[model samples]
Target chain A: NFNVAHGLAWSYYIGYLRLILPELQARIRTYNQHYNNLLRGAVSQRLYILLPLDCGVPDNLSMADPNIRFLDKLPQQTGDRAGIKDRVYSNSIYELLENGQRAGTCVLEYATPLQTLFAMSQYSQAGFSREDRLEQAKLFCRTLEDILADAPESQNNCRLIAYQEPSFSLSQEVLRHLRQE
Target chain B: NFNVAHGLAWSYYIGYLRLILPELQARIRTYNQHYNNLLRGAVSQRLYILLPLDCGVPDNLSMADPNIRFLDKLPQQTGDRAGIKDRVYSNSIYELLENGQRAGTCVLEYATPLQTLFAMSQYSQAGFSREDRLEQAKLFCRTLEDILADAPESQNNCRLIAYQEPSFSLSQEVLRHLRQE
Candidate 1:
């Protein structure tokens, strides 16, 4: 139940952004236009994005002209989807399109509910001290920051997605408490 | 400050027992009589008993004819102390006389204030978890229990003393909190 609730909370936040941010809407629309055009062009036109989705199924998956598709695993090769990348364990994807053509992709990475719970349990064990857990948290944020820094400066084609802080703060608190030794 | 407070608390408990427990008072009086006689006995009599003291000095140390003497260290050879033993790092002592003759002695074993403070500081460090601290506490009590078991069964000559539970429960709580992991 907590897993579904957490997923829904993230979905709501994304829904809010989709409603408010014109730039986000425009970018998504552009990607969708590119994707639709690719679908009509040829099976060879490889255009797919890797997006981290909170929900098991994308919100737009049921549409007659769905822009997003769920994958059981990540694609072994870039164009394995014929354009769509095979989804591995990742949750969401944002296919970057430039001038009506697939350029690069943005992969969204976040801990699943099970992963969060497991990490919390591990942190609570006798082996890990509170300081150790805090260090782990620090390292995680630092790695993400490094990834953000590596992204192309001018293209704005790659986006790293994550859950809202408030929505995930409970999990963070659990981890912190478990860190107590 | 904490040591003084702990001492006063134990004093209050003894005061309460002195006021209410006639049997306790009688027993102490009997022990005092035997102790006084031991002091008057021959210099060759070597009596000893282990005890725990609050203050650095024993309660009877200031008397005109003090029966108990504080030792810095345990006597290497039995008669090293023609009367007084070599002072080492130890705290206090209680001499037990059998039939008006020095037969055994009571030695008070307690951590020095400095030692106690150092231990607390070490326990507060990041490496020790609350659970680890609790385990240490349990081991301490268990070791004490084993010592008690090795004591002669019929001999009232030896006594193991401690503070009342309520008086030291706060200290126990602090240790318990430190044990959290």
Candidate 2:
């Protein structure tokens, strides 16, 4: 459901459209949709208790543009439409957890697009435990490994998925503590 | 009979012979006769001392051969004639006090054809002295100088002799002491 829902929607209207349109044209439409959603959800839930004013998106867009102006109406001018779009997928996962969904340990196995971008961009901002983050990087190797394994008739490259345990073991202990709590 | 009678008779025969012969042969014969008479007198004065017993003219001969034989007698074994000759001359100057007329040096110079030879030989036997030998050798150079001076005008091949003082001064002095005593 999640894959068909968000992934297909972005794959058609955003990703495919991005190939046909200039980046400014595509990002204008994409930013408006993401910004409006964040505004509507933020106001209706009165999630001011949970979200800091800058919690939505980064301020890389102009508020005078009709396509992204809705983000300016936020009660506090912490971020703009681009910042909300920047955080959407990761924030969606957090929203799902708030709505009483159990993502199973599989959530530990998977990284949303925004989570991946966050892990890559902010590096330390990924909410996963250190061990979980290391495991995620290891699991990311499965894509290449699957390609090599499934391509019996094709030439492919694969590499070993190696993980290094922290020398102190303190990180693992911290993970256990968090899980117990 | 030993005065004018004997002297007049001997002068008449010698003078007549000198006058009859060519000047060149006359000089030769005259010197020959004078050498013979000198040898006769030397022999009569000291028969045993004057002549080298081994190398002198045969024992039965009334007079010794005028050939200088004292140097000849040395190196009786063989092959050392030239060395012996040089040694004889060297010793004569070094030991016997060459041309010492007070001891009948002049008489010996003429009387013994080997005056140089005998003096040299005796000097060698007595052990040569360093001083007198070198002096005598230097004196001997006067003869060579005189020869070069009087050489025939046709004798273009003549070279000036290089004179260096003899180095046997010690042997010369030693012999001088012996001869002087």
Candidate 3:
């Protein structure tokens, strides 16, 4: 039945693939192009979507489909934090990765993003966002190693590596200096 | 017999502590004091000696002790790696950490020095000292993550973190970009 359905809508299938990826790529391209303009140079944030190697939606989604999220659309609430309700966020949106798609083939992983965003949202809701804990939204990055034991087998295959460009060398001399008393 | 020996030399023990650390710290103090002199400006290294929380000597050694190494004592090994044999190194020596003491309590660890030094000595021996591999000697950093499976539980407790000063950050913006493709 599924085969018959796909055959009858073969034209739609092509359109579907086109709908999924080209739009995603174009969105990514647009963000990439406007990123510097929107965020205003080296001080602004850089973002990327972590997608699964296979899109599991069986019919509609392709592997690695993307979605744009305007973080502010949550709107100015009864009370907001960091003046972030209006003054911050660079007037741009992030391409968010859904929690469902962590089984990646990219041979790597990192946190900092989900951790930061979630922490921001939580603190914002709690009014902690305006107070002492508020500064954390500007900070991100955490190690996944300790929690890896809870990950699905598929997610367990991930690795960590050095990011080459837009990167800084974490030299050993400093590490040795820290490792010692 | 050991109790009798200690009883006879308790005064020597206090002198022993004084001799071990004061001399060592002064050398490190001099190194810390003159590190800039030896190496110069913002480019010089900040050095430290990683001692085992327990010094494992059968006797005559306290829980932790320090030693100073003058790298040049090897006298720029005949036909060394890099112009390193003669030119570079800032004339300052690192206080080397012996591999045996790696079961550490600093809640930490790193590779780079041994890996770099051994690689350098190998290249220096092979006469590849002047070439590409030689540059790797100057390069000193590596991830200890993958190899952790082979490590003892004692060594596995180590963690990685951002260095606070004399440190540049490895921000996540670039990591997400690299992980994408």
Q: RMSD in angstroms, all models?
A: 29.1, 64.2, 27.8
Cα deviation of A22 in candidate 1 (Å)? 69
Q: Model 2 over residues A31-141: C-alpha lDDT tens digits?
A: 346654553332121111110111122222111111111122221111111101111111110111112331111001011122332232232221234444333343333
lDDT score, candidate 3, position B74: 11
Q: Which residue segments of model 1 deviate by more than 4 Å?
A: A1-181, B1-74, B77-105, B111-126, B129-135, B147-159, B164-181
User: What is candidate 3's CA lDDT for residue B62?
Assistant: 17
Report the Cα lDDT for candidate 2. 0.23
Interface RMSD for each candidate model? 32.6, 74.3, 31.9
Error of model 3, residue A128, in angstroms: 38
Of the true interface contacts, what fraction does each candidate have?
Answer: 0.00, 0.00, 0.00
In order of the candidates, what TM-score does chain B achieve? Answer: 0.28, 0.22, 0.20
**Of the candidates shown, which would achieve the greatest TM-score relative to the real structure?**
1
On the 0 to 100 scale, the lDDT of residue B181 in model 1 is 15
Q: Model 3: share of native contacts present?
A: 0.00
Q: For model 3 chain B, where is the 10-residue window of minimal lDDT?
A: B80-89
